[PDB]
Amino acid sequence: EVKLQQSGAELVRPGASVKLSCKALGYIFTDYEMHWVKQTPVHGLEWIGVIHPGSGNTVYNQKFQGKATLTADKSSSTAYMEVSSLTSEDSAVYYCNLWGRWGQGTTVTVSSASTKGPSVFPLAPSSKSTSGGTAALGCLVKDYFPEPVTVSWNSGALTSGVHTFPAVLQSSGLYSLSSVVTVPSSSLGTQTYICNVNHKPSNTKVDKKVEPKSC
Amino acid sequence: DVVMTQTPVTLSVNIGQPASISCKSGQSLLHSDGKTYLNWLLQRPGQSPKRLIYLVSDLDSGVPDRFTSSGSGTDFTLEISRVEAEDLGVYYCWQGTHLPHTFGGGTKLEIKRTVAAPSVFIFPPSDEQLKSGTASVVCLLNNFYPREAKVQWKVDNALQSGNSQESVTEQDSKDSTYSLSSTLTLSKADYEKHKVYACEVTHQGLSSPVTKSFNRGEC
Amino acid sequence: QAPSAAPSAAPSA
């Protein structure tokens, strides 16, 4: 259908630049004005600029003149935003959007600290995680930088009863999060539960099977 | 920048009750081309915004009939006839009439519901983590309301401070509850010095604190 | 083939 597909999460050094991508599908890319938006919990949603991909004409917010450069490839149906001279104020989620349709967004963290991929540990179902014929089980995604991690279960075929908790910041400056699901006790013998952990800054792609512990 | 002001900042509503959110602009959003480019977004934590309303009063596709919106010039309104559980999140107005385009601060719609006590679960460290020389113990409080809850860690009945981190979910889109996850982290050496690992939970739904514990090693 | 029924903003680019 109509679908804006943005590039994955980035860790970028202060002073450096980054270029984000946004692929349009299901409409005439060249005919409709593509917008870019910055989102932070301190400043909320801010409009960066708009590009006509057909003509290549751009209008910028005064606040983003020079900081942001909007580009487009007519061939691949892809919009591009380069953000340059990066400061702490530039860590944000970046969205492309037009006509009320929005990309999934791209988290950009400005830091000189090294990326660190997570350790993924099982939270095994046990008698201590059982209530009313159901078992809670999960994955502990420990010690990564920066945010975000993505967690799915059974490659996204399991969504009901999932809680993926907000990450906590440890003393180390690394993050940790847990993802838990509640499933029938009756079928722990027949059903397989796998957490799929993606951390794009460290090229981490982990599939961890979680099962009852053995003794 | 045309200043977009929403009210209230937070709306707390019972399921089935009405909700109304106000949006006012610094100047008129009537464009010279006749169209008034006032839009309404809905965003949940960790997800993209969703357009609900365009050109002031028009519902976008999939958007239930319980959503209505009108206004013109400066002052605007979004109304929900009867709020459903899935209507929660932050509602944003924004204007595409004037350059630069500007967004309201958001109104967060929170759902009121009955007290629900947490289900309390505890997870010893994995053997894979212990091999690496760290022990993380996870206490899970599932599906409770309201959001305020207290976790205390007890090791061989001794109250812990300084070695735990917790976080609470956003409100659940289906039962309007919260869950919380707390992690006690020790060295493998320290973990192996003690037997009883206990999570003690205080919540409005509980007439006294409930303890979930295991004995280390015991299978 | 537009992305939707209506634009969020007036053409500007």
PDB file of C-alpha atoms in Angstrom, chain A residues 25-173:
ATOM      1  CA  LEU A  25       5.878   3.041  -2.249  1.00  0.00           C
ATOM      2  CA  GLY A  26       2.204   2.970  -3.457  1.00  0.00           C
ATOM      3  CA  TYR A  27       2.043   6.545  -4.918  1.00  0.00           C
ATOM      4  CA  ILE A  28       3.751   8.769  -7.596  1.00  0.00           C
ATOM      5  CA  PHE A  29       6.896   9.800  -5.593  1.00  0.00           C
ATOM      6  CA  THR A  30       7.820  12.649  -7.998  1.00  0.00           C
ATOM      7  CA  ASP A  31       4.359  14.378  -7.774  1.00  0.00           C
ATOM      8  CA  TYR A  32       3.917  14.975  -3.963  1.00  0.00           C
ATOM      9  CA  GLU A  33       5.862  17.157  -1.481  1.00  0.00           C
ATOM     10  CA  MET A  34       7.836  15.041   1.092  1.00  0.00           C
ATOM     11  CA  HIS A  35       8.267  16.538   4.614  1.00  0.00           C
ATOM     12  CA  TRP A  36      10.845  15.893   7.358  1.00  0.00           C
ATOM     13  CA  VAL A  37      10.174  16.307  11.086  1.00  0.00           C
ATOM     14  CA  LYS A  38      12.349  16.151  14.237  1.00  0.00           C
ATOM     15  CA  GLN A  39      10.937  14.677  17.475  1.00  0.00           C
ATOM     16  CA  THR A  40      12.430  15.123  20.983  1.00  0.00           C
ATOM     17  CA  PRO A  41      10.811  14.769  24.418  1.00  0.00           C
ATOM     18  CA  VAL A  42      12.072  18.332  25.308  1.00  0.00           C
ATOM     19  CA  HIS A  43      10.983  20.277  22.109  1.00  0.00           C
ATOM     20  CA  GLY A  44       8.215  17.915  20.727  1.00  0.00           C
ATOM     21  CA  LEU A  45       7.551  17.742  16.939  1.00  0.00           C
ATOM     22  CA  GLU A  46       9.386  20.354  14.801  1.00  0.00           C
ATOM     23  CA  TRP A  47       9.030  20.853  10.985  1.00  0.00           C
ATOM     24  CA  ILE A  48      12.536  20.774   9.294  1.00  0.00           C
ATOM     25  CA  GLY A  49      11.604  21.250   5.560  1.00  0.00           C
ATOM     26  CA  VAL A  50       9.738  20.009   2.419  1.00  0.00           C
ATOM     27  CA  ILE A  51      11.131  18.750  -0.973  1.00  0.00           C
ATOM     28  CA  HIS A  52       9.292  18.408  -4.316  1.00  0.00           C
ATOM     29  CA  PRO A  53      11.122  15.240  -5.499  1.00  0.00           C
ATOM     30  CA  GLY A  54      10.033  15.936  -9.132  1.00  0.00           C
ATOM     31  CA  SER A  55      11.508  19.493  -9.348  1.00  0.00           C
ATOM     32  CA  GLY A  56      14.002  19.047  -6.426  1.00  0.00           C
ATOM     33  CA  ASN A  57      12.855  22.423  -4.946  1.00  0.00           C
ATOM     34  CA  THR A  58      13.090  22.729  -1.107  1.00  0.00           C
ATOM     35  CA  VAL A  59      11.701  25.079   1.604  1.00  0.00           C
ATOM     36  CA  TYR A  60      13.452  24.962   5.033  1.00  0.00           C
ATOM     37  CA  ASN A  61      12.392  26.116   8.467  1.00  0.00           C
ATOM     38  CA  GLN A  62      14.722  29.056   9.389  1.00  0.00           C
ATOM     39  CA  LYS A  63      15.716  27.030  12.543  1.00  0.00           C
ATOM     40  CA  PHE A  64      17.181  24.222  10.283  1.00  0.00           C
ATOM     41  CA  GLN A  65      18.760  26.266   7.386  1.00  0.00           C
ATOM     42  CA  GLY A  66      22.323  24.794   7.013  1.00  0.00           C
ATOM     43  CA  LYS A  67      21.815  22.048   9.721  1.00  0.00           C
ATOM     44  CA  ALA A  68      19.576  20.028   7.273  1.00  0.00           C
ATOM     45  CA  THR A  69      19.841  19.351   3.474  1.00  0.00           C
ATOM     46  CA  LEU A  70      16.910  17.565   1.684  1.00  0.00           C
ATOM     47  CA  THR A  71      17.755  15.452  -1.463  1.00  0.00           C
ATOM     48  CA  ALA A  72      15.812  12.965  -3.671  1.00  0.00           C
ATOM     49  CA  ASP A  73      16.577  10.156  -6.158  1.00  0.00           C
ATOM     50  CA  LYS A  74      13.650   9.890  -8.677  1.00  0.00           C
ATOM     51  CA  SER A  75      15.064   6.446  -9.784  1.00  0.00           C
ATOM     52  CA  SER A  76      14.725   4.581  -6.388  1.00  0.00           C
ATOM     53  CA  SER A  77      11.717   6.700  -5.119  1.00  0.00           C
ATOM     54  CA  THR A  78      13.964   7.710  -2.120  1.00  0.00           C
ATOM     55  CA  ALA A  79      14.048  11.024  -0.170  1.00  0.00           C
ATOM     56  CA  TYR A  80      17.285  11.904   1.741  1.00  0.00           C
ATOM     57  CA  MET A  81      18.045  14.293   4.632  1.00  0.00           C
ATOM     58  CA  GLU A  82      21.699  15.037   5.561  1.00  0.00           C
ATOM     59  CA  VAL A  83      22.048  16.662   9.046  1.00  0.00           C
ATOM     60  CA  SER A  84      25.539  18.184   9.597  1.00  0.00           C
ATOM     61  CA  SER A  85      27.838  19.698  12.324  1.00  0.00           C
ATOM     62  CA  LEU A  86      26.050  17.396  14.816  1.00  0.00           C
ATOM     63  CA  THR A  87      25.677  18.581  18.471  1.00  0.00           C
ATOM     64  CA  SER A  88      23.917  17.052  21.528  1.00  0.00           C
ATOM     65  CA  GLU A  89      20.796  19.070  20.498  1.00  0.00           C
ATOM     66  CA  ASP A  90      20.607  16.892  17.304  1.00  0.00           C
ATOM     67  CA  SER A  91      19.940  13.466  19.037  1.00  0.00           C
ATOM     68  CA  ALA A  92      16.287  12.859  18.092  1.00  0.00           C
ATOM     69  CA  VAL A  93      13.860  10.680  16.160  1.00  0.00           C
ATOM     70  CA  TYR A  94      13.660  11.853  12.498  1.00  0.00           C
ATOM     71  CA  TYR A  95      10.490  11.180  10.403  1.00  0.00           C
ATOM     72  CA  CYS A  96       9.617  11.624   6.725  1.00  0.00           C
ATOM     73  CA  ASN A  97       5.855  12.166   6.138  1.00  0.00           C
ATOM     74  CA  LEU A  98       3.348  13.424   3.510  1.00  0.00           C
ATOM     75  CA  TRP A  99      -0.494  13.542   3.197  1.00  0.00           C
ATOM     76  CA  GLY A 100      -0.858  12.100   6.766  1.00  0.00           C
ATOM     77  CA  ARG A 101       1.379   9.065   6.047  1.00  0.00           C
ATOM     78  CA  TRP A 102       4.589   8.830   8.224  1.00  0.00           C
ATOM     79  CA  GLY A 103       7.737   6.671   8.123  1.00  0.00           C
ATOM     80  CA  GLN A 104       8.599   4.516  11.188  1.00  0.00           C
ATOM     81  CA  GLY A 105      11.383   7.035  12.075  1.00  0.00           C
ATOM     82  CA  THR A 106      15.174   6.821  12.605  1.00  0.00           C
ATOM     83  CA  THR A 107      16.760   7.332  16.064  1.00  0.00           C
ATOM     84  CA  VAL A 108      20.002   9.378  15.830  1.00  0.00           C
ATOM     85  CA  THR A 109      22.254   9.532  18.898  1.00  0.00           C
ATOM     86  CA  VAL A 110      25.128  12.112  18.872  1.00  0.00           C
ATOM     87  CA  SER A 111      27.966  10.730  21.080  1.00  0.00           C
ATOM     88  CA  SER A 112      31.760  10.037  20.864  1.00  0.00           C
ATOM     89  CA  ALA A 113      31.291   6.864  23.077  1.00  0.00           C
ATOM     90  CA  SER A 114      31.758   3.444  21.346  1.00  0.00           C
ATOM     91  CA  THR A 115      28.741   1.335  20.248  1.00  0.00           C
ATOM     92  CA  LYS A 116      28.243  -1.840  22.402  1.00  0.00           C
ATOM     93  CA  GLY A 117      25.947  -4.700  21.297  1.00  0.00           C
ATOM     94  CA  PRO A 118      23.709  -6.402  23.881  1.00  0.00           C
ATOM     95  CA  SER A 119      24.067  -9.748  25.646  1.00  0.00           C
ATOM     96  CA  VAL A 120      20.666 -11.498  25.317  1.00  0.00           C
ATOM     97  CA  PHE A 121      19.764 -13.801  28.238  1.00  0.00           C
ATOM     98  CA  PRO A 122      16.606 -15.936  28.693  1.00  0.00           C
ATOM     99  CA  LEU A 123      14.047 -15.334  31.462  1.00  0.00           C
ATOM    100  CA  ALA A 124      12.929 -18.993  31.652  1.00  0.00           C
ATOM    101  CA  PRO A 125       9.303 -19.854  32.521  1.00  0.00           C
ATOM    102  CA  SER A 126       9.241 -21.524  36.012  1.00  0.00           C
ATOM    103  CA  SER A 127       6.823 -22.185  38.938  1.00  0.00           C
ATOM    104  CA  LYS A 128       7.826 -18.610  40.042  1.00  0.00           C
ATOM    105  CA  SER A 129       6.445 -17.043  36.738  1.00  0.00           C
ATOM    106  CA  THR A 130       3.116 -18.946  36.576  1.00  0.00           C
ATOM    107  CA  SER A 131      -0.376 -17.521  37.295  1.00  0.00           C
ATOM    108  CA  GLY A 132      -3.841 -18.912  36.467  1.00  0.00           C
ATOM    109  CA  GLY A 133      -2.765 -21.522  33.855  1.00  0.00           C
ATOM    110  CA  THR A 134      -0.327 -19.011  32.170  1.00  0.00           C
ATOM    111  CA  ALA A 135       3.513 -18.730  32.223  1.00  0.00           C
ATOM    112  CA  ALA A 136       5.513 -15.498  31.857  1.00  0.00           C
ATOM    113  CA  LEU A 137       8.867 -15.813  30.066  1.00  0.00           C
ATOM    114  CA  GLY A 138      11.220 -13.279  28.389  1.00  0.00           C
ATOM    115  CA  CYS A 139      14.625 -11.968  27.312  1.00  0.00           C
ATOM    116  CA  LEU A 140      16.939  -9.669  29.290  1.00  0.00           C
ATOM    117  CA  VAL A 141      18.773  -7.498  26.706  1.00  0.00           C
ATOM    118  CA  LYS A 142      21.794  -6.332  28.771  1.00  0.00           C
ATOM    119  CA  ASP A 143      24.534  -3.683  28.339  1.00  0.00           C
ATOM    120  CA  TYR A 144      24.161  -1.939  24.946  1.00  0.00           C
ATOM    121  CA  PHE A 145      24.765   1.524  23.536  1.00  0.00           C
ATOM    122  CA  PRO A 146      23.103   3.483  22.191  1.00  0.00           C
ATOM    123  CA  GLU A 147      19.264   3.154  22.056  1.00  0.00           C
ATOM    124  CA  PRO A 148      17.362   1.674  20.379  1.00  0.00           C
ATOM    125  CA  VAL A 149      17.136  -2.162  20.505  1.00  0.00           C
ATOM    126  CA  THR A 150      14.168  -3.785  18.665  1.00  0.00           C
ATOM    127  CA  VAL A 151      12.657  -7.010  20.124  1.00  0.00           C
ATOM    128  CA  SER A 152      10.148  -9.255  18.323  1.00  0.00           C
ATOM    129  CA  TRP A 153       8.922 -12.741  19.308  1.00  0.00           C
ATOM    130  CA  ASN A 154       8.748 -15.695  16.885  1.00  0.00           C
ATOM    131  CA  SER A 155       9.756 -13.304  14.058  1.00  0.00           C
ATOM    132  CA  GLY A 156       6.668 -11.173  14.825  1.00  0.00           C
ATOM    133  CA  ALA A 157       4.058 -13.999  14.796  1.00  0.00           C
ATOM    134  CA  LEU A 158       3.710 -13.459  18.600  1.00  0.00           C
ATOM    135  CA  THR A 159       2.400 -10.001  19.672  1.00  0.00           C
ATOM    136  CA  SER A 160      -0.363 -10.779  22.241  1.00  0.00           C
ATOM    137  CA  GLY A 161       0.679 -10.357  25.895  1.00  0.00           C
ATOM    138  CA  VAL A 162       4.138  -8.957  24.989  1.00  0.00           C
ATOM    139  CA  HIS A 163       5.623  -6.199  27.199  1.00  0.00           C
ATOM    140  CA  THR A 164       8.877  -4.684  25.918  1.00  0.00           C
ATOM    141  CA  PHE A 165       9.866  -2.352  28.849  1.00  0.00           C
ATOM    142  CA  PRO A 166      11.574   1.030  28.480  1.00  0.00           C
ATOM    143  CA  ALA A 167      15.375   0.684  28.711  1.00  0.00           C
ATOM    144  CA  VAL A 168      17.112   1.804  31.947  1.00  0.00           C
ATOM    145  CA  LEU A 169      20.474   3.624  31.975  1.00  0.00           C
ATOM    146  CA  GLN A 170      23.042   1.725  34.127  1.00  0.00           C
ATOM    147  CA  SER A 171      25.962   3.469  35.994  1.00  0.00           C
ATOM    148  CA  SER A 172      28.216   2.327  33.083  1.00  0.00           C
ATOM    149  CA  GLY A 173      26.213   4.552  30.599  1.00  0.00           C
TER     150      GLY A 173
END
